[PDB]
Amino acid sequence: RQFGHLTRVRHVITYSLSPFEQRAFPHYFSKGIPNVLRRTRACILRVAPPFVAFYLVYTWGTQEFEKSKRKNPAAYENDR
Amino acid sequence: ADLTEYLSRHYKAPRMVLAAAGGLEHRQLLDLAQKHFSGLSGTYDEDAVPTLSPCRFTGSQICHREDGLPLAHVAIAVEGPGWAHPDNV
């Protein structure tokens, strides 16, 4: 496991450019924000709904905890 | 058409040199050049005279990966001086 003994690669050509010759942030807001959005659209459907379902169970459970904490109308009413 | 146009443009007298070396008399070479080479045209059509625009050197890499070949060949270089520069020495 070293550079030279990794694997057999053939017929590939890699064109590169010096970091001083090229830019650091090439088309960052131009090409990026769309690419970021595309990536968000790809994942969102798989990622979000469980956290939404958590939020629903969270607020509901806290709501129902506050309901059960509070008074009830059958506590000695219509019973003097 | 391309070959003949390339010839007609670039192969001309002011862009050319006749060199010689050995046992020969400069006067005689000049007579031979006058007698045979003076038939070449001596300037342009007022355009078509290409002059060299300077070439941009770019620090960069090219890596033709090919494991089938027996020995790796590497060539690394920085930007050169040009023919004129005394630094060459």
From Swiss-Prot, chain A:
Residues 1-37 are mitochondrial matrix. Keywords: Acetylation, Electron transport, Membrane, Mitochondrion, Mitochondrion inner membrane, Respiratory chain, Transmembrane, Transmembrane helix, Transport. It is found in: Mitochondrion inner membrane. The keyword DNA-binding does not apply. Residues 67-80 are mitochondrial intermembrane. The modification N6-succinyllysine is found at residue 31. One of its GO terms (cellular component) is respiratory chain complex III. It is a single-pass membrane protein. It holds the Pfam family UcrQ. The modification N6-acetyllysine is found at residue 31. Belongs to the UQCRQ/QCR8 family. Component of the ubiquinol-cytochrome c oxidoreductase (cytochrome b-c1 complex, complex III, CIII), a multisubunit enzyme composed of 11 subunits. The complex is composed of 3 respiratory subunits cytochrome b, cytochrome c1 and Rieske protein UQCRFS1, 2 core protein subunits UQCRC1/QCR1 and UQCRC2/QCR2, and 6 low-molecular weight protein subunits UQCRH/QCR6, UQCRB/QCR7, UQCRQ/QCR8, UQCR10/QCR9, UQCR11/QCR10 and subunit 9, the cleavage product of Rieske protein UQCRFS1. Component of the ubiquinol-cytochrome c oxidoreductase, a multisubunit transmembrane complex that is part of the mitochondrial electron transport chain which drives oxidative phosphorylation. This is Cytochrome b-c1 complex subunit 8. It comes from Bos taurus. The gene is UQCRQ.
Curated annotation (Swiss-Prot), chain B:
The chain holds residues 214 to 302 of 480 of the full protein. This is Cytochrome b-c1 complex subunit 1, mitochondrial. Component of the ubiquinol-cytochrome c oxidoreductase, a multisubunit transmembrane complex that is part of the mitochondrial electron transport chain which drives oxidative phosphorylation. Belongs to the peptidase M16 family. UQCRC1/QCR1 subfamily. Component of the ubiquinol-cytochrome c oxidoreductase (cytochrome b-c1 complex, complex III, CIII), a multisubunit enzyme composed of 11 subunits. The complex is composed of 3 respiratory subunits cytochrome b, cytochrome c1 and Rieske protein UQCRFS1, 2 core protein subunits UQCRC1/QCR1 and UQCRC2/QCR2, and 6 low-molecular weight protein subunits UQCRH/QCR6, UQCRB/QCR7, UQCRQ/QCR8, UQCR10/QCR9, UQCR11/QCR10 and subunit 9, the cleavage product of Rieske protein UQCRFS1. The lineage of its organism: Eukaryota, Metazoa, Chordata, Craniata, Vertebrata. The modification N6-acetyllysine is found at residue 35. It comes from Bos taurus (Bovine). It is found in: Mitochondrion inner membrane.
